[PDB]
Amino acid sequence: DPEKVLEQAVIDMQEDLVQLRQAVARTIAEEKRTEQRLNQDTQEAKKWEDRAKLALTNGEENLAREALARKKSLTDTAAAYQTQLAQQRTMSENLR
């Protein structure tokens, strides 16, 4: 009977749309986690910059350049996480 078949098809669509809600919730967690990662990496980059300011105040340009190399690594890693975040933002909107 076509009425029973189309009712069952719409029931199966309830299970599929619940899987799509789980995929949205996963994608939402990935954007939030990559934001959290780049936010803490940029806060650590400030700590290493302040360690460089302390080293320069003591005249240790060697330690200041080493601390700035940590700053460079962290800000480049945060830019990689912003690039990943752009993929998660567009995917999150696509599933939405």
Partner: protein, 48 residues
């Protein structure tokens, strides 16, 4: 110098691979959701 280079190479390689795996899995999940949203309910609609 060999140890310092070795640890730097390992650390960067592992973290780049891990974030690439995570973003690749998220990208294919978003694409799979477009394919299910395009294909779902079609056989039930034809049967109705």
């Amino acid at each position: 110098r060999n140890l310092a280079a070795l640890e730097a190479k390992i650390s960067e390689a592992k973290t780049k691979k891990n974030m690439l795996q995570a973003r690749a899995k998220a990208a294919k999940a978003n694409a799979e959701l477009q394919q299910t949203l395009g294909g779902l309910g079609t056989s039930s609609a034809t049967s109705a």
